[PDB]
Swiss-Prot record:
Free-text note on domains in this protein's UniProt record: The TPR repeat-binding motif mediates interaction with TPR repeat-containing proteins like the co-chaperone STUB1.
Gene source species: Homo sapiens (Human)
Job description of the protein: Molecular chaperone that promotes the maturation, structural maintenance and proper regulation of specific target proteins involved for instance in cell cycle control and signal transduction. Undergoes a functional cycle that is linked to its ATPase activity which is essential for its chaperone activity. This cycle probably induces conformational changes in the client proteins, thereby causing their activation. Interacts dynamically with various co-chaperones that modulate its substrate recognition, ATPase cycle and chaperone function. (Microbial infection) Seems to interfere with N.meningitidis NadA-mediated invasion of human cells. Decreasing HSP90 levels increases adhesion and entry of E.coli expressing NadA into human Chang cells; increasing its levels leads to decreased adhesion and invasion.
Subunit structure, as described in the record: Homodimer. Identified in NR3C1/GCR steroid receptor-chaperone complexes formed at least by NR3C1, HSP90AA1 and a variety of proteins containing TPR repeats such as FKBP4, FKBP5, PPID, PPP5C or STIP1. Forms a complex containing HSP90AA1, TSC1 and TSC2; TSC1 is required to recruit TCS2 to the complex. The closed form interacts (via the middle domain and TPR repeat-binding motif) with co-chaperone TSC1 (via C-terminus). Interacts with TOM34. Interacts with TERT; the interaction, together with PTGES3, is required for correct assembly and stabilization of the TERT holoenzyme complex. (Microbial infection) Interacts with herpes simplex virus 1 protein US11; this interaction inhibits TBK1-induced interferon production.
UniProt PTM comment: ISGylated.
Protein name: Heat shock protein HSP 90-alpha
Region (Interaction with NR3C1): 1-207
Family: Belongs to the heat shock protein 90 family.
Disulfide-bonded cysteines: none
Section of the entire sequence shown: 17 to 223 of 732
Modified positions (N6-acetyllysine) in chain numbering: 42, 68
Length: 207
């Protein structure tokens, strides 16, 4: 297991998301589903020129899987997946400018629900999760687990869990007072409200 420090500005953003009083937390799900959709768009586009990229799985879709026993909500997709370099370097570097702009916008009167307009919607996960685990598999690479409970650091390791084929699984370890997002009717409500026209099947598992 390798442990890394967040860039200072990203650590600052995560603390802001964790510490700021803001009741409209449900928007986290839209941001994560949007990121899944983008990843599915990507593998779909690449396969138009290289069909063999779907050898790792042809079905393009999103599963939402609540687990009250583990207190997790998992978002699973069969998109393009992420490389080790994505998890350690690339996505963090890209996030620097959007993080800066978002925090400046909040100072000028924007609210947290606008976070996706700055390309850093992922971090809204920490509105509801004490820990986020991301398992991912890209065609050109091994299966990895990225994880962070904030506090300035994250880890990356090779994942030895069930093989995924291709795609990304975001496991939200929910805060004790955010278990409403494990309820079928609540998740259904949020998907209909904010993610109504996503161009891939979204299957909400029940327990
Ligand atoms: N400094 C720094 C720094 C160093 C690393 C990170 N992480 C780099 C990995 N990220 C993993 C989540 C990426 C965002 C995401 C949410 N739902 C998805 C669904 C998907 O299908 C794909 C794909 N493909 C992507 C996502 C976390 C942040 C941050 C900051």
């Amino acid at each position: 297991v390798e442990t890394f420090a967040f860039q200072a500005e990203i650590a600052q953003l995560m603390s802001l998301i964790i510490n700021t009083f803001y009741s409209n937390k449900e928007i986290f799900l839209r941001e994560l589903i949007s990121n899944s959709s983008d990843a599915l768009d990507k593998i779909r586009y690449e396969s138009l020129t290289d069909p063999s990229k779907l050898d790792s799985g042809k079905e393009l879709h999103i599963n939402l899987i609540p687990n009250k026993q583990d207190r997790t909500l998992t978002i699973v997709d069969t998109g393009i997946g992420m490389t080790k370099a994505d998890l350690i370097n690339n996505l963090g570097t890209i996030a620097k400018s959007g993080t800066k702009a978002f925090m400046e916008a909040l100072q000028a009167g924007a609210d947290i629900s606008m976070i996706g307009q700055f390309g850093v919607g992922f971090y809204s996960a920490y509105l509801v999760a004490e820990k986020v685990t991301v398992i991912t598999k890209h065609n050109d690479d091994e299966q990895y687990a990225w994880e962070s409970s904030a506090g300035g650091s994250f880890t990356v390791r090779t994942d030895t869990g069930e093989p995924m084929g291709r795609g990304t699984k975001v496991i939200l370890h929910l805060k004790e007072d955010q278990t409403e997002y494990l309820e079928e009717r609540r998740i259904k409500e949020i998907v209909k409200k904010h993610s109504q026209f996503i161009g891939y099947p979204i299957t909400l598992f029940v327990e």
